Design a protein around this ligand. Sequence first.
Ligand code: SF4
Ligand code: SF4
Length: 81
Amino acid sequence: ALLITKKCINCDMCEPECPNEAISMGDHIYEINSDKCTECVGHYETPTCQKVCPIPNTIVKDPAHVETEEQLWDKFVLMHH
Ligand code: SF4
Ligand code: SF4
């Protein structure tokens, strides 16, 4: 799953887009919920928030290492048959 890094400049571009509504605003910058991010696997060939992002601030994150079939299985449990 992805993370948004401190360069985020709070443009909201990325929130209406995420197919699994895992992005929200909070304390200082937009935040991605680890639990709900499939890195867009089952919806887009490329992670839709990196796509909209004007700055390139969204990165894979290291304390939330997922293999592609665990991303996949998140997508199927979320959206399902
Ligand atoms: S990579 Fe996809 S699922 Fe994850 S926060 Fe971005 S738009 Fe959402
Ligand atoms: S699109 Fe990029 S700069 Fe704008 S809020 Fe989302 S992560 Fe931050």
